[PDB]
Amino acid sequence: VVSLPRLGEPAPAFEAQTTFGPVKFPDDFKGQWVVLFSHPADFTPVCTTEFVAFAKNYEEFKKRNVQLIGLSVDSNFSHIAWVMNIKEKFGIEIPFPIIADHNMEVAKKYGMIHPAQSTTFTVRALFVIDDKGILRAMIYYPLTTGRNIREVIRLVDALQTADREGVATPADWVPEPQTWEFTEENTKVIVPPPTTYEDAVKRLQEGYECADWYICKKKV
Amino acid sequence: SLPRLGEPAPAFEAQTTFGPVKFPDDFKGQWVVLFSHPADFTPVCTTEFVAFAKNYEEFKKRNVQLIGLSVDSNFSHIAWVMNIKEKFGIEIPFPIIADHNMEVAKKYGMIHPAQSTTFTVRALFVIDDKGILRAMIYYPLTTGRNIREVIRLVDALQTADREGVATPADWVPEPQTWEFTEENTKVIVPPPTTYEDAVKRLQEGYECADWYICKKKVA
Amino acid sequence: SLPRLGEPAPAFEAQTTFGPVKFPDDFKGQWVVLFSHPADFTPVCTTEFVAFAKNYEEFKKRNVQLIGLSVDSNFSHIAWVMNIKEKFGIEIPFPIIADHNMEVAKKYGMIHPAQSTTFTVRALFVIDDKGILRAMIYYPLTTGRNIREVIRLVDALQTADREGVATPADWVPEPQTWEFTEENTKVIVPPPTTYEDAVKRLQEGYECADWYICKKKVA
Amino acid sequence: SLPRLGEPAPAFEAQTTFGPVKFPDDFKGQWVVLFSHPADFTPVCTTEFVAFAKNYEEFKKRNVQLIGLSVDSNFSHIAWVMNIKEKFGIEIPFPIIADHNMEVAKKYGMIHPAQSTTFTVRALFVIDDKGILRAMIYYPLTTGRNIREVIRLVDALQTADREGVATPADWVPEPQTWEFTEENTKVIVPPPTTYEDAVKRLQEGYECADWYICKKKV
Amino acid sequence: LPRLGEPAPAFEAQTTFGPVKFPDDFKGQWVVLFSHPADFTPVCTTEFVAFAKNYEEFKKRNVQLIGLSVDSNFSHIAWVMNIKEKFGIEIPFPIIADHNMEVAKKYGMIHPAQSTTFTVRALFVIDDKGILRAMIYYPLTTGRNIREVIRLVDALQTADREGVATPADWVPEPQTWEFTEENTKVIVPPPTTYEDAVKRLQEGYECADWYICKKKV
Amino acid sequence: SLPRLGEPAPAFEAQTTFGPVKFPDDFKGQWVVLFSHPADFTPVCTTEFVAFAKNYEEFKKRNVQLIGLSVDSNFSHIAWVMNIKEKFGIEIPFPIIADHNMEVAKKYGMIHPAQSTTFTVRALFVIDDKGILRAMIYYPLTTGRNIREVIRLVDALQTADREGVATPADWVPEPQTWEFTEENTKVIVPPPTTYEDAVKRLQEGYECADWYICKKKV
Amino acid sequence: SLPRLGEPAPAFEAQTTFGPVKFPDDFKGQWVVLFSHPADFTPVCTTEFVAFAKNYEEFKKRNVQLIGLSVDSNFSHIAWVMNIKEKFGIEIPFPIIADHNMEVAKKYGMIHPAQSTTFTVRALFVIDDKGILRAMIYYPLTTGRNIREVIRLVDALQTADREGVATPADWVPEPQTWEFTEENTKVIVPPPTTYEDAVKRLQEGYECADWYICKKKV
Amino acid sequence: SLPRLGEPAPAFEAQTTFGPVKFPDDFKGQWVVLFSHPADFTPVCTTEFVAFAKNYEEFKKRNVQLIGLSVDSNFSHIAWVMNIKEKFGIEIPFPIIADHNMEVAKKYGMIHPAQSTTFTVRALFVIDDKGILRAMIYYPLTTGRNIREVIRLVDALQTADREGVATPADWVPEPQTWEFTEENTKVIVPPPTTYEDAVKRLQEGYECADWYICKKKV
Amino acid sequence: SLPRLGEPAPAFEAQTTFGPVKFPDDFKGQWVVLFSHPADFTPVCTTEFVAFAKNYEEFKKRNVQLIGLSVDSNFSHIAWVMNIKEKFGIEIPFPIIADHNMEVAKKYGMIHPAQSTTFTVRALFVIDDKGILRAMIYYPLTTGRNIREVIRLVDALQTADREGVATPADWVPEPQTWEFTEENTKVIVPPPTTYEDAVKRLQEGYECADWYICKKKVA
């Protein structure tokens, strides 16, 4: 240990508290595909942009029979406070549950703790799990680097197409011709968040584009 | 066991289509994208190798050394590269590790027995100029990877190091559009597994660049 | 295990909202009131933090460093302090430990599994200027502490040391009156445990400064 | 070891000044405040017993059974109760456990060797009507407890249970004022530890109800 | 280490003809099981072509040929396709894909000083009862003698049928084994990098493909 | 165990018809063909020894030392060599190891119990001038070996070393024809296993050079 | 590993020049003289086998089955018996055990390593009609046995059993004379151990019936 | 266990009728015939000792030291030698070992429990001038040994050593005749085992030199 | 070990000059005097056997079975009995055990290695009619026993059992006189230990009945 979760085998089972109530995983989602992903910490900026991006794409996952579910080692009360904060600062209501894995029990089962990254927070792990509870694909991005939400959607399409049609999908496959546009807003980088209250107060006076003390953007 | 982010990438020495490599020591000062593919002469893999080859200059300008890996021999590797050049007009410009006894594959968690007890899955590892493992992905045998996301990941990691910043969801260094065309919608027929089936496959009316790589469209 | 009265307080290093601390090395020559709270953004804890903050000068003039602790991250801590400042007009003036992996909490017997396997109980420890544990209390998750009794306990301990005396039941250093007003009679609605319930909670007609802290009076 | 909040309070059988007790069998349906004191015939302890005794009806109307404990014998306990009645005019109305061999004290983590290897500290435990340990306090040998805070704690715990609520910092059930008078500022001279010193102690000009309990002001 | 006169080590494996359960699937047939180090290497190609050309010689003797290497079955098919394209001959017998060397170790085919990854040139004659009858281990450098394999089968089948032994150099009827000028050409060790494989086709050898170049000594 | 190709041939010291040998130390700088035969005075073995002897100059000119081996004593070896000289007119020109206690045979995996628990099988090993095992064959008791294939194998290995080449299937150094005549088609009657049967065997009308070596055609 | 007098002779099954034997079960009701010899085609052994063969009727008339044994193969045994018939005109009339792997030899203590680690010494065992070991002798490789003493020993043991008597030193059943002639004084040249020495031995001026059996006088 | 031919004879120190002996060290430079006999005052033993005594000069001129051995005491040995002198007029001229605790007997494998758990069998060992065990015989309790075969064996071993030869079956150094007379045909009545039977034995009409040695003819 | 007084005498089966004995089963209802002697054909032993034999009727009328024992064979025993008969005119009337392997001797502690590792010492055991060991003596190789004391001991033990009494020092059943004459003063020359010495011993002028038993007087 820590172990690599194994592709093609049942996703590691667990029971946990979430912002939507208790879940028995992946048991409660049988018959649904599941995108389980982790984020290091509530009230941190990359994580906020990822939650907003997932929320904005919630209907794309819903129409593909995919249940999105997040996870961090934060408490459920921090989770609810953070979702409230996102609604207040961005006008977006997170529409999917977030697991409160305080004791890292789920994180350890999924290889989400990488001590050289953090001994306390998960990395940016993401797992695609099919309607039979089988782990199908996974990615591990570091604390610095937000994920690509459209690639998660494409991966789901590819796996569902493989199962439905009995085929494989080539490099860069999509189900229909399409264009992924990245705008000027997608070029803004994130200032690493303050770690003391005094620094958080000072941060708001440093001239960045800050929706809140922990999420300040600039360009390179 | 899961390779550890933020630590030196598991070291190894191996034979490749470019000669022996001392990993990651031979790539000091360079970023490395190490990836695995289940088997030479299989179709998703071929499309991935062509896509990486076409994007080789994109990696070169980012100081990234691409290096592939499978459990096939170097002679099968060379034969497959010859086959790719003949059937697709593309010359693979990066080395492929011949990991015959799965020693490197096991160090990187590339063997997932429910997927295959003999082939690697579609693992990919981004390693920085200090040999530190920075990010990784594990896709299954069915599902080709997204080459532009590998480039975006490298850009995001290099910018983080250079600027002392983090990058948000869907970050790119400049505005851009990733076009996927009708050609990107063709799916792959699972390759034949007997010689007889390989001969019969070529008579089924598909678009086949060779016996192992046949494409079609699905409704 | 129960920390031992009269012995050095269990040593630790931790992250806090004021930066890293080495206990008790950093607090030699000062008295310390170390206390824990189950979770940021929960209501009893908020009332306790405001009460300690309002009494910060009372502790400072007694050479007492207040330091809180929960298993929450420093980012949750900072966000919670920001929330308290906006909703209650008080800036928490003392550090809060981020005891992510419960290592400090376990040294101090702060985890009582029938109360919570993830949150600390309401433990509080008075530690003298030589780092010796002098007194402790363990209140449950339901029940906020009495801040004036914490001050009285510190006075009693400092007077004992200074004068070579003991202090009787209900001892105070000078005649005084502890007033409890109508505001002190309001009880706390247990906080919502789902986001949906948190949205409904703000519509139920309680006296709510925020979703997690709603008050009412009894019968 | 640390007794566990939210779990049954450690069970025991013991001799007391009221006769034998079986905990928790005898107190089912009642709240219990179990507290310890280091030694009979010592002054802080005396002030605490008098304060608890004066508040006995406050505990009784809250369905609270008070029970004290020290490692002294029942004969010392009775002698001390007799002494308190003569010097202070109050009869201790609750039982005191004689925990001769420290068996109950060890179950409750009441022995802290740097304080004393032979006496308990000033431990106090609130136990509910189902025998569940609800709250605990550990004060040192120097420092008398706050009796009104014990009452407040019981009120807060009982209100939480009855109403399904939590109680804030400094909560009380109704507006009220805790007055501390000039009498509450007197400190205690540490008691003599030899018979000769105890005889001399009564001649030193302190405010002494007996050889072991002398007060002064600072 | 495989034991003569005892049942041949049993196994199940993937092949270019589909799965095989060995030797159960071949009960009632003689079996010549042989290994080769690697697909797309030159000595191996000449041996496979020679076995293929003699396929009818083995079939009329109730002999099932079956090859084996540690290459994948996809590499095998690609190699069989390559042999068909470059030499005009279709390999008519199955090749085992012994990916994890499990069968190879049962037969002692791995000799680490030769290769820690490839089998040597092992060959096993197995009778219709599944009993191991004879075996040879040639090194990576040295192709086998296919007519000697046929003679060995004839000698073993005659021994069983007639209750006799066969002397040194025995054959069932007078015959002549002709070796021509073509049989004198030696093989250039195959390239081990892609760059060398491209350069190899320009070195002036007689090359059917990059990996199989011949010359004379 | 299985002797390992590419590694030093298992070392041994042994008695032979030519005197003691230290193997492969005594044959440094020479290639060695070490082969075994089940038993002196048995018929396939006789035909193989005659064939090796007739080809002795072919091996000598290739810098190859032939050395045979069985579990028989040197006294049996000498008697058998004398017998071969009288019946076939050829004097065995290479040493035969007397491996009485099967120690060498076991080092070379020459004992296969289902074939025989007492005799070696027809094992043959090609060893180079540096003592390295290069190739090996194991034929069963029924089946005589192909001496010209042993020569071809030596040629192929020596050519590989000298030229830095590999040799294809069916390779020879120059065009040639291996003739097998009517004489090569005669089969061998399994030798008698009792003295009475050996006396009778010589009266049964086969083509017999001696009691143990009788031939016929099929 | 001394076989024990008066106990059943160690049982074994073996191949012989007469076919398989189950010992001593196959010889129930017969006395058995089991003896060993180091090696076929060695000279002292040849003289002993000839002497036993010449005395075959003497043993037969005493209900004695002779059976020899060496570690040579049965094919060597048959070859050696053929050789004795060819060179001396005598046909060995009793079976020889082929104890290839020394299993029987070890049961009978026939292997003495300072004599030979590969051949038996000249052991001889008299076994009665009940399979019981009655007497034994162990002569070294140099020293041929006394065949008439074997017969006298059998006579003495059979007389002891039949008559319920003991037999004194030098006892015989009837007055008699053992003649040893000039021919019995010839000694044996130790046999050659290389083929070259065997060829030269025939030119050294001894009286040689074959390369391995040369006599002279001292 | 089995004494090993070609290895030093098992060493021992013992009392003998000639005084203490260090064996075989005291006999370095001499050949030794060490033999055992089951019991003093038993009949076959007496005939063997007399025969050895009569042949003492035959052994002496061959540089052979005879030495007997039984588990009897040295005092019983002297008494028996005295008895042999009285009844037969022959003085035993060689030492007899007193092996009371069977320590020497066990070293030489002389105790065969089915024969006797208390007496040695009729073991005989030829040991050369370097202390090396050269040959051995084990005869049962019933059966006296052949003294002339012991002499022939010594002659055969000494000739082998001196001349570098082996000796054939029935070898002797010069032509000779072993005469066995009517006296050599008399059998021995098993000796009495009770005093009453020993007295009765002298009246049963046998040819008795003493109670324990009675002969008759068969 | 020391045989234990008041316990059954160690049981055994043995060969003797009178045939096999099962001890003490064959002697139930009889008293037994079991005694040992180092070696047949030694002089002290001979004088003891003659004295016991001459006193045979004294033991028989007291219901005592004499039984001797040495490690010699019965064949030596018989020869020795024959010798004593010829030289002294007395036929030994009691059995002698042939304890070849010292098995009985070890049960009775008769082997004392500093005296002899091969011979018994001069041990004697009085055993009653119930098989119980009643008394024992151990004299060394040099020193002949007192046969009249053996008889007195038997009488004392039988009287004690019969009458329920003890017997004092020097007790006898009726007044009596033990006379020791000039013949009882002759000492024994230690026996020869080589045959040559035995021949010479008979020529040295001692009073010799045989080579092993020569007497003289002290001067």
Chains C and A, touching by 3 or more CB pairs within 8 angstroms = yes
C-beta separation of B155 from B173 below 8 A: yes
**C-alpha to C-alpha distance for B213 and E75, rounded to whole angstroms:** 13
**C-alpha to C-alpha distance for B208 and B62, rounded to whole angstroms:** 34
- The CB-side HSE value for I139 (13 A sphere, CA atoms) comes to 17
Give the number of other CB atoms < 10 A from CB of residue I117. Answer: 12
Domain ranges of chain D: 1-218
The fold for domain G1-218 equals Glutaredoxin (3.40.30)
* φ, ψ (nearest 5 deg) of residue H88: -125, -10
* Alpha carbon separation from E31 to B91, E16, E37, E103, H101 (Å, rounded): 42, 16, 20, 15, 70
Q: Which amino acid is at B34?
A: L
Give the number of other CB atoms < 10 A from CB of residue B26. Answer: 13
**C-alpha to C-alpha distance for C100 and C81, rounded to whole angstroms:** 17
Which of these, D160, D146, B166, lies nearest to A214 by C-alpha position? B166
Provide the token pair at E83.
Answer: 């042999």
Residue in this structure with the two tokens 């008519």, named with its chain if needed = E92
Identify the bridge partners of residue A149 per DSSP, sorted by sequence position.
Answer: none
Give a three-class secondary structure readout of chain I.
CCCCCCCECCCEEEEEECECEEECHHHCCCEEEEECCCCCCCHHHHHHHHHHHHCHHHHHHCCEEEEEEECCCHHHHHHHHHHHHHHHCCCCCCCEEECCCCHHHHHCCCCCCCCCCCCCCEEEEEECCCCEEEEEEEECCCCCCCHHHHHHHHHHHHHHHHHCCCCCCCCCCCCCCCCCCHHHHCEECCCCCCHHHHHHHCCCCCEEEECCEEEECCC
Q: How far is C-alpha E146 from the geometric centre of its chain's CA atoms?
A: 9
C-beta separation of F14 from F97 below 8 A: yes
**C-alpha to C-alpha distance for I124 and I215, rounded to whole angstroms:** 25
* Angle, CA of B212, B216 and B218, to the nearest 5°: 135
Give the number of other CB atoms < 10 A from CB of residue I63. Answer: 14
User: Do I195 and H42 lie within an 8 Å CB cutoff?
Assistant: no
Which of these, H122, H178, H147, H188, lies nearest to H52 by C-alpha position? H147
C-beta separation of H76 from I72 below 8 A: yes
Provide the token pair at A215.
Answer: 């999420």
User: Do A183 and B175 lie within an 8 Å CB cutoff?
Assistant: yes
C-beta separation of E142 from F135 below 8 A: yes
Alpha-carbon dihedral angle through residues G146, G148, G154, G158, given to the nearest 10 degrees: -150
Sign of the CA dihedral I208, I214, I215, I216? positive
How does DSSP classify residue C93?
-
Q: How far is C-alpha C2 from the geometric centre of its chain's CA atoms?
A: 19
Coil, strand or helix at B138 = strand
Identify the bridge partners of residue H51 per DSSP, sorted by sequence position.
Answer: none
User: Do H39 and I73 lie within an 8 Å CB cutoff?
Assistant: yes
Residue in this structure with the two tokens 């295959």, named with its chain if needed = B116
All residues of chain B having their beta carbon less than 8 Å from the beta carbon of residue A137 are 138-140, 143
C-beta separation of H115 from G5 below 8 A: yes
Identify the bridge partners of residue C96 per DSSP, sorted by sequence position.
Answer: C68
C-beta separation of B134 from B126 below 8 A: yes
Give the number of other CB atoms < 10 A from CB of residue D205. Answer: 8
Calculate helix-pair angle for A76-90, A45-56, nearest 10 degrees: 70
**C-alpha to C-alpha distance for A8 and B1, rounded to whole angstroms:** 16
**C-alpha to C-alpha distance for H61 and H64, rounded to whole angstroms:** 7
**C-alpha to C-alpha distance for B62 and B55, rounded to whole angstroms:** 11
Of A50, A154, A191, the CB nearest to B165: A191
Concatenated DSSP letters for A55-70? HHTHHHHHHTTEEEEE
C-beta separation of F174 from E184 below 8 A: yes
Radius of gyration of chain H (CA): 18
- CATH architecture assigned to E1-217: 3-Layer(aba) Sandwich (3.40)
Among residues H33, H45, H153, H156, the one annotated as catalytic is: H45
Provide the token pair at B73.
Answer: 């021999």
User: Do B195 and E118 lie within an 8 Å CB cutoff?
Assistant: no
**C-alpha to C-alpha distance for B109 and B120, rounded to whole angstroms:** 9
The binding site of G consists of 122
**C-alpha to C-alpha distance for E87 and E45, rounded to whole angstroms:** 10
- Tell me whether strands A23-25 and A33-37 are parallel, antiparallel or unpaired: unpaired
Give the number of other CB atoms < 10 A from CB of residue C205. Answer: 8
Give the number of other CB atoms < 10 A from CB of residue F86. Answer: 10
Q: Which residues contact B43 (CB under 8 A, 6 or more apart)?
A: A168, A170, B188, B189, B191, B212, B213, B214
Nearest C-alpha of chain A: how many angstroms from C212?
Answer: 8
Residue in this structure with the two tokens 């230290």, named with its chain if needed = F22
All residues of chain F having their beta carbon less than 8 Å from the beta carbon of residue G40 are 73, 75-76, 79
Q: How far is C-alpha H28 from the geometric centre of its chain's CA atoms?
A: 20
Q: Is E168 exposed, middle or buried (0-12, 13-18, 19+ CB in 10 A)?
A: buried
CATH of domain C1-219: 3.40.30.10
- Tell me whether strands I31-35 and I122-127 are parallel, antiparallel or unpaired: antiparallel
Q: What is the enclosing helix (H) or strand (E) of B105? A: helix B103-107
Residue in this structure with the two tokens 């996927």, named with its chain if needed = B180
Provide the token pair at B13.
Answer: 């020495």
How does DSSP classify residue B52?
H
**C-alpha to C-alpha distance for E151 and E138, rounded to whole angstroms:** 17
Say if residue G140 is preceded by a cis peptide, omega within 30 of 0.
no
**C-alpha to C-alpha distance for G30 and G37, rounded to whole angstroms:** 22
Among residues E20, E33, E43, E44, the one annotated as catalytic is: E44
* φ, ψ (nearest 5 deg) of residue A179: -135, 125
**C-alpha to C-alpha distance for B17 and B49, rounded to whole angstroms:** 14
| Long-range contacts, B155-160 (Cβ 8 Å, 24+) | B155/B62, B156/A144, B156/A145, B156/A146, B157/A142, B157/A144, B157/A145, B157/B126, B157/B128, B158/B31, B158/B62, B159/A189, B159/A220, B160/A144, B160/A145
* φ, ψ (nearest 5 deg) of residue C70: -145, 175
C-beta separation of G154 from G64 below 8 A: yes
- Tell me whether strands C187-188 and C207-210 are parallel, antiparallel or unpaired: unpaired
CATH of domain A1-220: 3.40.30.10
**C-alpha to C-alpha distance for E144 and G89, rounded to whole angstroms:** 52
How does DSSP classify residue D11?
P
**C-alpha to C-alpha distance for G193 and F19, rounded to whole angstroms:** 8
Q: Is C45 among the residues known to form the active site?
A: yes
Chains H and I, touching by 3 or more CB pairs within 8 angstroms = yes
Nearest C-alpha of chain G: how many angstroms from H21?
Answer: 26
All residues of chain A having their beta carbon less than 8 Å from the beta carbon of residue B168 are 45-46, 49-50, 146, 186, 188-190, 217
Provide the token pair at C184.
Answer: 């002190």
Which of these, A52, A143, A150, A50, lies nearest to B146 by C-alpha position? A150
All residues of chain F having their beta carbon less than 8 Å from the beta carbon of residue G193 are 15, 74-75
**C-alpha to C-alpha distance for C116 and D4, rounded to whole angstroms:** 11
**C-alpha to C-alpha distance for H83 and H91, rounded to whole angstroms:** 9
Provide the token pair at B200.
Answer: 């019969």
Q: Which amino acid is at A141?
A: Y
Q: Is I205 exposed, middle or buried (0-12, 13-18, 19+ CB in 10 A)?
A: exposed
Resolution of the model in angstroms: 1.8
Nearest C-alpha of chain B: how many angstroms from A219?
Answer: 9
Residue in this structure with the two tokens 């715990």, named with its chain if needed = D157
- Tell me whether strands C122-127 and C133-139 are parallel, antiparallel or unpaired: antiparallel
Chains in contact with E, counting 3 or more C-beta pairs less than 8 Å apart as contact? B, F
Calculate helix-pair angle for C147-163, C43-54, nearest 10 degrees: 50
User: Do H19 and I194 lie within an 8 Å CB cutoff?
Assistant: yes
Q: Which residues contact G11 (CB under 8 A, 6 or more apart)?
A: G22, G23, G24, G25
C-beta separation of C166 from D44 below 8 A: yes
Identify the bridge partners of residue E95 per DSSP, sorted by sequence position.
Answer: E67
**C-alpha to C-alpha distance for F132 and E114, rounded to whole angstroms:** 11
**C-alpha to C-alpha distance for B100 and B102, rounded to whole angstroms:** 6
Q: What is the enclosing helix (H) or strand (E) of B74? A: helix B74-88
Provide the token pair at A217.
Answer: 């953007």
* Alpha carbon separation from G172 to C182, D155, G135, G168, H172 (Å, rounded): 138, 125, 17, 9, 20
Most F CBs within 10 Å, among G13, G17, G21, G41, to test the F interface: G41
Identify the bridge partners of residue D207 per DSSP, sorted by sequence position.
Answer: D215
How does DSSP classify residue F185?
G
Concatenated DSSP letters for C139-208? E-TTB---HHHHHHHHHHHHHHHHHT-BB-TT--SS-EEEEE-GGGG-EEPPPPSSHHHHHHHTTS-SEE
* Angle, CA of D36, D39 and D40, to the nearest 5°: 105
Nearest C-alpha of chain A: how many angstroms from B109?
Answer: 7
What separation, in Å, do the N-terminal and C-terminal C-alpha atoms of chain B show?
40
Coil, strand or helix at E208 = strand
C-beta separation of E32 from E149 below 8 A: yes
**C-alpha to C-alpha distance for C129 and C32, rounded to whole angstroms:** 7
Which of these, G81, G95, G66, lies nearest to F199 by C-alpha position? G81
Calculate helix-pair angle for E73-87, B74-88, nearest 10 degrees: 60
Provide the token pair at G215.
Answer: 């006599």
What separation, in Å, do the N-terminal and C-terminal C-alpha atoms of chain I show?
41
Coil, strand or helix at F65 = strand
Sign of the CA dihedral I183, I189, I192, I193? positive
Of F147, F165, F216, the CB nearest to E187: F165
C-beta separation of C71 from C103 below 8 A: no
Give a three-class secondary structure readout of chain H.
CCCCCCCECCCEEEEECCCCEEECHHHCCCEEEEECCCCCCCHHHHHHHHHHHHCHHHHHCCCEEEEEEECCCHHHHHHHHHHHHHHHCCCCCCCEEECCCCHHHHHCCCCCCCCCCCCCCEEEEEECCCCEEEEEEEECCCECCCHHHHHHHHHHHHHHHHHCCEECCCCCCCCEEEEECHHHHEEECCCCCCHHHHHHHCCCCCEEEECCEEEEEC
Among residues B14, B39, B45, B133, the one annotated as catalytic is: B45
